[PDB]
Design an enzyme around this catalytic site. Structure first.
Site, PDB file in Angstrom:
ATOM      1  N   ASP A   1       0.831  -1.208   0.000  1.00 44.92           N
ATOM      2  CA  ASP A   1       0.000   0.000   0.000  1.00 44.92           C
ATOM      3  C   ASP A   1       0.868   1.262   0.000  1.00 44.92           C
ATOM      4  O   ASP A   1       0.631   2.205   0.755  1.00 44.92           O
ATOM      5  CB  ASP A   1      -0.994   0.002   1.169  1.00 44.92           C
ATOM      6  CG  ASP A   1      -2.120   1.019   0.979  1.00 44.92           C
ATOM      7  OD1 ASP A   1      -2.197   1.636  -0.109  1.00 44.92           O
ATOM      8  OD2 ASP A   1      -2.925   1.229   1.918  1.00 44.92           O
TER       9      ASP A   1
ATOM     10  N   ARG B   1      -0.007   9.020   1.557  1.00 49.70           N
ATOM     11  CA  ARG B   1      -0.781   8.944   2.801  1.00 49.70           C
ATOM     12  C   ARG B   1      -0.174   7.978   3.811  1.00 49.70           C
ATOM     13  O   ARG B   1      -0.527   8.039   4.998  1.00 49.70           O
ATOM     14  CB  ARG B   1      -2.230   8.511   2.509  1.00 49.70           C
ATOM     15  CG  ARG B   1      -2.289   7.217   1.674  1.00 49.70           C
ATOM     16  CD  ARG B   1      -3.723   6.724   1.348  1.00 49.70           C
ATOM     17  NE  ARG B   1      -3.606   5.455   0.631  1.00 49.70           N
ATOM     18  CZ  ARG B   1      -3.494   5.345  -0.693  1.00 49.70           C
ATOM     19  NH1 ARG B   1      -3.558   6.417  -1.473  1.00 49.70           N
ATOM     20  NH2 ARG B   1      -3.337   4.154  -1.239  1.00 49.70           N
ATOM     21  N   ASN B   2       0.704   7.069   3.369  1.00 41.11           N
ATOM     22  CA  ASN B   2       1.373   6.118   4.251  1.00 41.11           C
ATOM     23  C   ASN B   2       2.823   6.502   4.547  1.00 41.11           C
ATOM     24  O   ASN B   2       3.598   5.656   5.001  1.00 41.11           O
ATOM     25  CB  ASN B   2       1.330   4.708   3.652  1.00 41.11           C
ATOM     26  CG  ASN B   2       0.142   3.889   4.165  1.00 41.11           C
ATOM     27  OD1 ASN B   2      -0.198   3.964   5.327  1.00 41.11           O
ATOM     28  ND2 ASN B   2      -0.493   3.126   3.282  1.00 41.11           N
TER      29      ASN B   2
ATOM     30  N   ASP C   1       2.963   2.048   7.366  1.00 36.66           N
ATOM     31  CA  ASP C   1       1.787   1.350   6.841  1.00 36.66           C
ATOM     32  C   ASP C   1       0.705   1.427   7.916  1.00 36.66           C
ATOM     33  O   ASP C   1       0.719   0.653   8.877  1.00 36.66           O
ATOM     34  CB  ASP C   1       2.113  -0.091   6.469  1.00 36.66           C
ATOM     35  CG  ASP C   1       0.912  -0.837   5.903  1.00 36.66           C
ATOM     36  OD1 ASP C   1      -0.159  -0.217   5.723  1.00 36.66           O
ATOM     37  OD2 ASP C   1       1.040  -2.050   5.635  1.00 36.66           O
TER      38      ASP C   1
HETATM   39  C1  LIG Z   1       2.015   3.163  16.244  1.00 39.52           C
HETATM   40  C2  LIG Z   1       2.322   2.365  15.014  1.00 39.52           C
HETATM   41  C3  LIG Z   1       2.151   0.998  15.035  1.00 39.52           C
HETATM   42  C4  LIG Z   1       2.438   0.257  13.903  1.00 39.52           C
HETATM   43  C5  LIG Z   1       2.895   0.862  12.757  1.00 39.52           C
HETATM   44  N1  LIG Z   1       3.175   0.023  11.650  1.00 39.52           N
HETATM   45  C6  LIG Z   1       3.777   0.453  10.487  1.00 39.52           C
HETATM   46  O1  LIG Z   1       3.893   1.615  10.136  1.00 39.52           O
HETATM   47  C7  LIG Z   1       4.304  -0.604   9.601  1.00 39.52           C
HETATM   48  C8  LIG Z   1       5.199  -0.238   8.623  1.00 39.52           C
HETATM   49  C9  LIG Z   1       5.713  -1.188   7.763  1.00 39.52           C
HETATM   50  C10 LIG Z   1       5.331  -2.506   7.889  1.00 39.52           C
HETATM   51  C11 LIG Z   1       5.902  -3.523   6.950  1.00 39.52           C
HETATM   52  N2  LIG Z   1       4.833  -4.356   6.326  1.00 39.52           N
HETATM   53  C12 LIG Z   1       5.339  -5.642   5.781  1.00 39.52           C
HETATM   54  C13 LIG Z   1       4.645  -5.963   4.478  1.00 39.52           C
HETATM   55  N3  LIG Z   1       3.187  -5.808   4.642  1.00 39.52           N
HETATM   56  C14 LIG Z   1       2.416  -6.383   3.513  1.00 39.52           C
HETATM   57  C15 LIG Z   1       2.715  -4.475   5.107  1.00 39.52           C
HETATM   58  C16 LIG Z   1       3.908  -3.606   5.440  1.00 39.52           C
HETATM   59  C17 LIG Z   1       4.432  -2.866   8.878  1.00 39.52           C
HETATM   60  C18 LIG Z   1       3.909  -1.918   9.743  1.00 39.52           C
HETATM   61  C19 LIG Z   1       3.071   2.235  12.739  1.00 39.52           C
HETATM   62  C20 LIG Z   1       2.779   2.987  13.865  1.00 39.52           C
HETATM   63  N4  LIG Z   1       2.953   4.382  13.889  1.00 39.52           N
HETATM   64  C21 LIG Z   1       1.955   5.319  13.579  1.00 39.52           C
HETATM   65  N5  LIG Z   1       0.722   4.897  13.258  1.00 39.52           N
HETATM   66  C22 LIG Z   1      -0.174   5.853  12.984  1.00 39.52           C
HETATM   67  C23 LIG Z   1       0.123   7.200  12.990  1.00 39.52           C
HETATM   68  C24 LIG Z   1       1.418   7.534  13.329  1.00 39.52           C
HETATM   69  C25 LIG Z   1       1.865   8.911  13.338  1.00 39.52           C
HETATM   70  C26 LIG Z   1       1.035   9.927  12.915  1.00 39.52           C
HETATM   71  C27 LIG Z   1       1.476  11.234  12.928  1.00 39.52           C
HETATM   72  C28 LIG Z   1       2.760  11.481  13.358  1.00 39.52           C
HETATM   73  N6  LIG Z   1       3.604  10.528  13.759  1.00 39.52           N
HETATM   74  C29 LIG Z   1       3.134   9.272  13.741  1.00 39.52           C
HETATM   75  N7  LIG Z   1       2.334   6.605  13.629  1.00 39.52           N
END
Ligand SMILES: Cc1ccc(NC(=O)c2ccc(CN3CCN(C)CC3)cc2)cc1Nc1nccc(-c2cccnc2)n1
Ligand SMILES: Cc1ccc(NC(=O)c2ccc(CN3CCN(C)CC3)cc2)cc1Nc1nccc(-c2cccnc2)n1
Ligand SMILES: N#CCC(=O)Nc1nc(-c2ccc(Cl)c(Cl)c2)cs1
Ligand SMILES: N#CCC(=O)Nc1nc(-c2ccc(Cl)c(Cl)c2)cs1
Lengths: 264, 256
Positions: free
Chosen positions: A127, A131-132, A145
């Site tokens: 994705d 936005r991500n 993500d």
């Molecule tokens: C709190 C949290 C918990 C989990 C995640 N997860 C991820 O961001 C993430 C990124 C990459 C992967 C890798 N992944 C492997 C392949 N698959 C298919 C999907 C992607 C997985 C999770 C983010 C966050 N952080 C987060 N979430 C929402 C908003 C914010 C945020 C908003 C505004 C300012 N600062 C931070 N920060």
């Protein structure tokens, strides 16, 4: 309990992050380091699966896991917080004399660095889009993500193949055969490049979603945006090759941006 | 107590900074062959000494000893290699003291102010002229002894000073940092500042100042003291920005 486990009392929970924009995610404080953090909470297997994935991902341009709380409910996933929030709203609201062409190039280069890392470690994003992504001070960008297909309302995600797809970011083979790969991420990256070059316009502006797949299969591609360097547009077009195997690798994309950046 | 030392433990050299700090002299703490700063001279003096015995933080000037038995009286602090922050900003090389360093300096000051906030101290004269610079862009808050341009509205009109009026002054200090030590409210008649602030005039964002830094400036300059952030909140926002800026600085170096 592994090395990522942290005591719940290490975190001050403040308020839902963005008033529910991201679901059950709260702004918090990691007290001992005076750092703002983001905390995702479980309102169960997928939750712990996401945590396990993030323990394997460590890159300056990917969101960094800081800790988890799994001893009693509610479970926590704790990450860094990024000062300026998501890249799409940032581009739409920024001072464009400040966030100028060299900054845009710098943001694209960091995103391709993050994707080169996921490529190297055999991950698929699935994705990728502005936005991500998140923006920090000194033009830092990190790929994240947020699981937005559930959260966001409107036409960004629409029903397709019995699921929710961001049609205008989705590679042809994913739309048609539900096939996802690092090469379908490359396609989305090309769209993300166009988002960056237009300071966050919606892609294929004014073209109904019903036309998108047919137009692409008949070789229609978005035109070079105003002010976009020709070499950057060449990269977009390579990302949008109909055959996944004809698309460049993220290693190649980042090398190309690297060269461009030091020539600036 | 532990803090009392003899006046002969210290060789007193010439006055410091052309006397611009008053009766503060360069000295040498003999037993350690260490250069120090020595303030000399009512009971305000001894109140200051008593307060400084209660203060200990990486970014607050460190008391070393006192001489409080018989005149002349001494307050002895560490000596800071690079002088006061305002002169440092005005004379520095801006390619070396760039946006990452300016951010580091603001972060250090907010940490000192969070500490004073936690101890229920009020500074009452926060400004760049009251900060000191050491090696590796180390910054410590001091108090050398109205500056209308740094003074919160409720302090101007009602003589009320609090940690929240320090927060206001900190916002002005950010603007000093962001302009490399320009004087605030350029060209504006100081006698009209109070009414301007009441009608919601604030300084514009300085050229090159990051947007979140300016948003924090404007939060510090909320009219109502209860609407201003705490120093804990300010320090948290700056440590968060500083980590981002450090990561980016390394990414950018790696590209070259
Ligand atoms: C709190 C949290 C918990 C989990 C995640 N997860 C991820 O961001 C993430 C990124 C990459 C992967 C890798 N992944 C492997 C392949 N698959 C298919 C999907 C992607 C997985 C999770 C983010 C966050 N952080 C987060 N979430 C929402 C908003 C914010 C945020 C908003 C505004 C300012 N600062 C931070 N920060
Ligand atoms: C030699 C000395 C004696 C006393 C002090 N005092 C302080 O710096 C100080 C700081 C904070 C407080 C806390 N206080 C809480 C209550 N409110 C109302 C006032 C602030 C008190 C004193 C500093 C110094 N140090 C000092 N003074 C002047 C110049 C220099 C100096 C100059 C150049 C290079 N190196 C050092 N160094
Ligand atoms: N207003 C407006 C539109 C405009 O000026 N567009 C621009 N886009 C860029 C640009 C540079 C490098 C990359 Cl990598 C990318 Cl994606 C974009 C340079 S100017
Ligand atoms: N022309 C010109 C002067 C100039 O570039 N000014 C700047 N100020 C900043 C800045 C960064 C962090 C903080 Cl915390 C502060 Cl206060 C300021 C970055 S560039």
């Amino acid at each position: 309990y592994d090395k990522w486990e942290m005591e719940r009392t290490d975190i001050t929970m403040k308020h839902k992050l963005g008033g529910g924009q991201y679901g059950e995610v709260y702004e918090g404080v990691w007290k001992k380091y005076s750092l703002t953090v983001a905390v995702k909470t479980l309102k169960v297997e997928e939750f712990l699966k996401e945590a396990a994935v993030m323990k394997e991902i460590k890159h300056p341009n990917l969101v960094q896991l800081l800790g988890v709380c799994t001893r009693e409910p509610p479970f926590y996933i704790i990450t860094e917080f990024m000062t300026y929030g998501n890249l799409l709203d940032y581009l739409r609201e920024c001072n464009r004399q400040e966030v100028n062409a060299v900054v845009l190039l710098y943001m694209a280069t960091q995103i391709s660095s993050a994707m080169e890392y996921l490529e190297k470690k055999n991950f698929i994003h699935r994705d990728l889009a502005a936005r991500n992504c998140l923006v920090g001070e000194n033009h830092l960008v990190k790929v994240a993500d947020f699981g937005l297909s559930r959260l966001m309302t409107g036409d960004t995600y629409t029903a397709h193949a019995g699921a929710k797809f961001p049609i205008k970011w989705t590679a042809p083979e994913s739309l048609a055969y539900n096939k996802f790969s690092i090469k379908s991420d490359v396609w989305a990256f090309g769209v993300l490049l166009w988002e960056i070059a237009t300071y966050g316009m919606s892609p294929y502006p004014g073209i109904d979603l019903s036309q998108v797949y047919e137009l692409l299969e008949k070789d229609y591609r978005m035109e070079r945006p105003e002010g976009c360097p020709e070499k950057v547009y060449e990269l977009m077009r390579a990302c949008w090759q109909w055959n996944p195997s004809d698309r460049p690798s993220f290693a190649e994309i980042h090398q190309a941006f690297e060269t461009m950046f030091q020539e600036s």
